[PDB]
Amino acid sequence: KYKGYTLLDKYPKEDDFRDAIYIEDMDNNDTSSVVYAFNVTKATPTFKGSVVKVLYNEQFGSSKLFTEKAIKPRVKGDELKNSVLRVIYNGYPSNALGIKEKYQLTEGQFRKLTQRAVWNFTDSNLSLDKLSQKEIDALNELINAKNAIPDNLVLNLYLPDDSYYQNLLGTKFVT
């Protein structure tokens, strides 16, 4: 069992990115992991200080399951899975293409853009709202990249006990 939460004060006001999301094992707050949401019409996980702890179950992110769970994906199957894997490989914090440094982004801005790039595929939603031109440039690079991804990178899905809340995803390497 995991809890998922937003860390509303993680980034400064100028990054316009409060909904930085993490998951944590309920049996251990020694470690937390960065994750990204999908199904944006649902509610974000509650803030870390909330008296409401939003619980999640992890599941292997197969193409079939991912597509089934996405409410309005832009593409389906392997293409949806691989498109998202690549965004994460190229986004915060993997940064495989050096996009962060190229556009002189802060950590918060880069993570925000990675989230927006995920939504482009999972939710058919490319939001440019409140972005600077360099952020728009970075986001467009991120969503249009076609670099090869490592062959052993896989998707983890996190499904909330309560369907009111957003689904979450992360990646890992099979070693």
Author numbering: 102 to 276
Show the paper's wording:
Here we experimentally demonstrate that thioester domains are prevalent in Gram-positive surface proteins, and that they share a conserved three-dimensional structure despite being divergent in protein sequence. Putative TEDs appear in a variety of domain architectures, but are almost always located at the N-termini of proteins containing secretion signals and C-terminal LPXTG cell wall-anchoring motifs.
The only fully conserved residues, the thioester-forming Cys and Gln, are found in a [YFL]CΦζ motif (where Φ is any hydrophobic and ζ any hydrophilic residue) and a weak ΦQζΦΦ motif, respectively.
